[PDB]
Design a protein around this ligand. Structure first.
Ligand SMILES: *[C@@H]1O[C@H](CO)[C@@H](O[C@@H]2O[C@H](CO)[C@@H](O)[C@H](O)[C@H]2NC(C)=O)[C@H](O)[C@H]1NC(C)=O
Ligand SMILES: *[C@@H]1O[C@H](CO)[C@@H](O)[C@H](O)[C@H]1NC(C)=O
Ligand SMILES: *[C@@H]1O[C@H](CO)[C@@H](O)[C@H](O)[C@H]1NC(C)=O
Ligand SMILES: *[C@@H]1O[C@H](CO)[C@@H](O)[C@H](O)[C@H]1NC(C)=O
Ligand SMILES: *[C@@H]1O[C@H](CO)[C@@H](O)[C@H](O)[C@H]1NC(C)=O
Ligand SMILES: *[C@@H]1O[C@H](CO)[C@@H](O)[C@H](O)[C@H]1NC(C)=O
Lengths: 238, 29, 50, 299, 50, 50, 50
C-alpha cells in the first residue's frame, strides 16, 4: 500500500517578491524540513491503480507534493474541510490545455483504463472561478500548496530527470499562482485517473542567492549542530 | 621598479589584508 | 553593517520605512510612530558611538 | 580659529516628481457595495471582493454624508494616494448602539457574538443611518443579531448555524427557563430611539504589501525620467533617487530588489515592466578657515 | 474641503456632484446647509447643547 | 470571600449592555486569584454608564 | 547582582513578573506592558555590557 517513507532536502521556495544577488538570506517561514519523513504513494499508493478509492490525506498547515510521470494520470486536487458539499471546496483540474481553479460547494461524484469522465453535477453557490495555462506541463512536477492569511498559494517547479527518480542537486520552486481564497482547508486529496507528499512546518532557513535572482542552496537551521552553526554565522563554510 | 615605491614585504603585507559610497550608505561616510 | 541593518527594524512601529508612515497617516499618529522609530535609531547610534 | 570644521551636510535636491501606476481604467464599485439593494446582517455579513480597479474614494464622499467615517491604520484624507494589495469590503446593517463597538481591540457584545476586527487592523469603518432609506413601518428583516454565542469569535470569524445555548449541561430545546434562543431577529420601526435605529455600515479592510496586486487609487501617471535625481512613486513605493537602466536578471515573478541590507536597490515599472536601479549625491561639508583674525576667506 | 483647526467658512455655495455647475436641481445639487429648529420632543442625539 | 469565583454564572445569568475589564482580561477571570474582590452594586442612568 | 536585581523593576509596567502580565491580560495590552519591560531590560543589559 504505502511504501517506505523517504528523506528529501527539497521543497525550498522563494519566500517573497524580493530580488537578491550574492547574499545569504536567513528567513523564517513554512518549509519542508530537511530529512523529514515524507509519504510515498505502488502507483496510486494504498489504492490499487485501477480502483476508485483514494487516500483523502490531511492538510497540516501546508503540503509539499511531487509526481514523476509521463501519462499525466494525476489531473488535479481538491482542498476543503468536509469535502461533502456542505461548505465551500476548492478544485484544481488541468485538462492539458488550461487549468481551472474553482471554489464552489462541490459534491464528490466518485470520479477517477484511461477513461475520461466529468464530475460535480452538483456545484451550488459558486464563489470563485479562475483560469490559466497548464500547471503540470520525466518532469518531476514539484509543488507546494500553502494556505495562510486567506491566501492559497501554489509554488512549483518542473525539472526533467532521466536516470533517477529525483535529482541530487538543489532546485528552488518559483511561485506559480497566489490566489486570495479564504477557505480553512483542513484536508485534501489528489485527483487521478507515484506521488510524494510531505508537510510544511515553521522553520528557519539560510538561503544562498546566485549572482542572478535564484536560490542555489539552503540550510535547515534546526537539522544538526553544524547547520545551526552555519545559520548563526551567516555562512555555508565554517 | 613598481609604481608604488614599497619593499617586496610591504607589497605582500598590503596584498594580504583586504568616490561612490556604494555600501552601507545611510548617512555613514 | 549592524548600524545600517538597525534601520530595517520597527521597534514597535507599524513600519520601518519612514516614507510609508508619512504617506499613510496624518500628523498626530505619524508623530507617535516616528517617535518610536527615533528612539530606536538613537539607541542604535549611541551604541555604535560607544 | 584656524582649522577645518565640519558644519553641515549637502544633498542634491530632486527636480521632478514621477508617479507610475499600471493602466487600469476600471473603477472600483465601492458605492455599489454600500448601496446594496438588500443588506446583509451583522449575524451574516456580506464579504465582497474589490480588485483590479481604481480605488477612487471621492465617490464615497459624493455618495452620502456619513454618520461615521473613521480610518484606524490609514489617514481618512490619504486613501486616494495609497495602494492597497487586498482591499476587502464587509457590508452589513447594525443597530446604532453597537456602531461604536466596530473598532479594533475593543470589548463588547457584538464583538464577541457577531463580528470583530483584529487588534492589528488596517482599514476604515463607514456608517450611514438607514432610517430614511429602507426602514419601513412594518420593519425590515435584513437585521439579524446573535443574542448569545457559545464562545467568543475570532477576528473576521463567521458562525451561522443556529443552536440553542444550554443553561446547564442537559440539552434544552424550546423550554425558555433553560433555553437561550440564539437569535433576536427583529424589524424595527422608524420611531425607535437612536440606539435601535439601523445603520448601513461598510468596513474596508486594507492589507498593505507594497502592491503585488495594485487596485491603486486614481493617480495620474507621468513620463519616466532616468539619470536624474527625482521623487519617484512606483506603485505605492515612494522614494527619492536616480533611476538607471538595470543589468540584473530578475525573474518575471519578482518586482522589488534589495541589497545585503534591506535597502531597496531596484524596482519594476508598473507599465513597461523595465527593471530600474535606484541609486541614492549627498555628503558632508567642511569649511577651511585661516582664522577670522587673519582673513575672512574660506574654502 | 476639510477645515483646518479654528477655521471658519461662512459663504454658502452649492457643492456639485460632478464638474458641471448645479443650482437648485436636487439630483446634482448638495445644498450646503441644514438649518433647522428642533422641538423638545426629539431624541437626545438631536437635543441642543450650549 | 472564601468561595469559588466562577464567572461563567455571569455569562449564563444575562446578556450585558457592558462587560469591560480594565486591568484584567474579560476571558481570563476564571484562571486568576483575587485577594480582596469587592463588589459595588447600584442602578444608574445610561448616559453616565460611560 | 545589579543586572539580576534590575529584573524586579517594573519600569512603569503594572508588574515586574512577565508571567503575571501574560496570565492577566489579553495580547493587545500585555504587549504594551511587555514592551515597557523589554525597554527596561534592554537598557539594563546595554549598561552592563558597556
Ligand atoms: C547569470 O545569468 C546569465 C545569463 O543572464 C548566465 O549566463 C552568462 O551570462 C553572461 C552575461 O555576461 C555571459 O557572458 C555568459 O557567456 C553566460 N553564460 C552562459 C553559459 O550562457 C550566467 O551564467 C548566470 N550566472 C551564474 C553564476 O550562473
Ligand atoms: C534516507 O536517505 C537515502 C538517500 O541517502 C534514501 O535512499 C533512503 O531511502 C532514506 N532512508 C530512510 C528514510 O530510512
Ligand atoms: C477543518 O475541517 C474540519 C472538518 O470537520 C472543520 O470542522 C474545521 O472547522 C476546519 N478547520 C477550521 C480552522 O475551520
Ligand atoms: C570624476 O568623474 C570623472 C568623469 O566624469 C572621472 O574621470 C574621475 O575619475 C572622477 N573623479 C574621481 C576622483 O574618481
Ligand atoms: C443608490 O441608492 C439610491 C437610493 O435612493 C437608489 O435610488 C440608486 O438607484 C442606488 N444606486 C445604485 C448604483 O445602487
Ligand atoms: C453580497 O455581494 C454579492 C457580490 O456578488 C452580491 O451578489 C449580493 O447580492 C450581495 N448580497 C447582499 C445581501 O448584500
Amino acid at each position: 500500500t504505502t511504501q517506505s517513507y523517504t528523506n528529501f532536502t527539497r521543497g525550498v521556495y522563494y519566500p517573497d517578491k524580493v530580488f537578491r544577488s550574492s547574499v545569504l538570506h536567513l528567513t523564517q517561514d513554512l518549509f519542508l524540513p530537511f530529512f523529514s519523513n515524507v509519504t510515498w504513494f505502488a502507483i496510486s499508493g494504498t489504492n490499487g491503480t485501477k480502483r476508485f478509492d483514494n487516500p483523502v490525506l490531511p492538510f497540516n498547515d501546508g503540503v509539499y507534493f511531487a509526481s514523476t510521470e509521463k501519462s499525466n494520470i494525476i489531473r488535479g486536487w481538491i482542498f476543503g474541510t468536509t469535502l461533502d458539499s456542505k461548505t465551500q471546496s476548492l478544485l484544481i483540474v488541468n485538462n492539458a490545455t488550461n487549468v481551472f481553479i474553482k471554489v464552489c460547494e462541490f459534491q464528490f461524484c466518485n470520479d477517477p483504463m484511461e477513461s475520461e469522465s466529468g464530475v460535480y453535477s452538483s456545484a451550488n453557490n459558486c464563489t470563485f472561478e479562475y483560469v490559466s495555462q497548464p500547471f503540470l506541463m520525466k518532469n518531476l512536477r514539484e509543488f507546494v500548496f500553502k494556505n495562510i492569511d486567506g491566501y492559497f498559494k501554489i509554488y512549483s517547479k518542473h525539472t526533467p530527470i532521466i536516470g533517477r527518480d529525483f535529482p541530487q542537486g538543489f532546485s528552488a520552486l518559483e511561485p506559480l499562482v497566489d490566489l486570495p481564497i479564504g477557505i480553512n482547508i483542513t484536508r485534501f486529496q489528489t485527483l487521478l485517473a507515484d506521488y510524494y507528499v510531505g508537510y510544511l512546518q515553521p522553520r528557519t532557513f539560510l538561503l544562498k542567492y546566485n549572482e542572478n535572482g535564484t536560490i542555489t542552496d539552503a540550510v535547515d537551521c534546526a537539522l544538526d549542530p553544524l547547520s545551526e552553526t552555519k545559520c548563526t554565522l551567516k555562512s555555508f563554510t565554517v | 621598479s613598481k609604481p608604488s615605491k614599497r619593499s617586496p614585504i610591504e607589497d605582500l603585507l598590503f596584498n594580504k589584508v583586504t568616490l561612490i559610497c556604494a555600501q552601507k550608505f545611510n548617512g555613514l561616510t | 553593517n549592524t548600524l545600517v541593518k538597525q534601520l530595517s527594524s520597527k521597534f514597535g512601529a507599524i513600519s520601518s520605512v519612514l516614507n510609508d508612515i508619512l504617506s499613510r497617516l496624518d500628523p498626530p499618529e505619524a508623530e507617535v510612530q516616528i517617535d518610536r522609530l527615533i528612539t530606536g535609531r538613537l539607541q542604535s547610534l549611541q551604541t555604535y558611538v560607544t | 580659529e584656524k582649522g577645518i570644521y565640519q558644519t553641515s551636510n549637502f544633498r542634491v535636491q530632486p527636480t521632478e516628481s514621477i508617479v507610475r501606476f499600471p493602466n487600469v481604467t476600471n473603477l472600483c464599485p465601492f458605492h455599489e457595495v454600500f448601496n446594496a439593494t438588500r443588506f446583509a446582517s451583522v449575524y451574516a455579513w456580506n464579504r465582497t471582493r474589490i480588485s483590479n480597479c481604481v480605488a477612487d474614494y471621492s465617490v464615497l464622499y459624493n455618495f452620502a454624508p456619513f454618520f461615521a467615517f473613521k480610518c484606524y491604520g490609514v489617514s481618512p484624507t490619504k486613501l486616494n494616494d495609497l495602494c492597497f494589495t487586498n482591499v476587502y469590503a464587509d457590508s452589513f446593517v447594525i443597530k446604532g448602539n453597537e456602531v461604536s463597538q466596530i473598532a479594533p481591540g475593543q470589548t463588547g457584545n457584538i464583538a464577541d457574538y457577531n463580528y470583530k476586527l483584529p487588534d492589528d487592523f488596517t482599514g476604515c469603518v463607514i456608517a450611514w443611518n438607514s432610517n430614511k432609506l429602507d426602514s419601513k413601518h412594518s420593519g425590515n428583516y435584513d437585521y439579524w443579531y446573535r443574542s448569545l454565542r457559545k464562545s467568543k469569535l475570532k477576528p473576521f470569524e463567521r458562525d451561522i448555524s443556529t443552536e440553542i445555548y444550554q443553561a446547564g449541561n442537559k440539552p434544552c430545546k424550546g423550554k425558555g427557563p433553560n433555553c437561550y434562543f440564539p437569535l433576536e431577529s427583529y424589524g424595527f420601526r422608524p420611531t425607535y430611539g437612536v440606539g435601535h435605529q439601523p445603520y448601513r455600515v461598510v468596513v474596508l479592510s486594507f492589507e498593505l504589501l507594497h502592491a503585488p496586486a495594485t487596485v491603486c487609487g486614481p493617480k495620474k501617471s507621468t513620463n519616466l525620467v532616468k539619470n536624474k535625481c527625482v521623487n519617484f512613486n512606483f506603485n505605492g513605493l515612494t522614494g527619492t533617487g536616480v533611476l538607471t537602466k538595470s543589468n540584473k536578471k530578475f525573474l518575471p515573478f519578482q518586482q522589488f530588489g534589495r541589497d545585503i541590507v534591506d535597502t531597496t536597490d531596484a524596482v519594476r515599472d508598473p507599465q513597461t515592466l523595465e527593471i530600474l536601479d535606484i541609486t541614492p549625491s549627498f555628503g558632508g561639508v567642511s569649511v577651511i578657515t585661516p582664522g577670522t583674525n587673519t582673513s575672512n576667506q574660506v574654502a
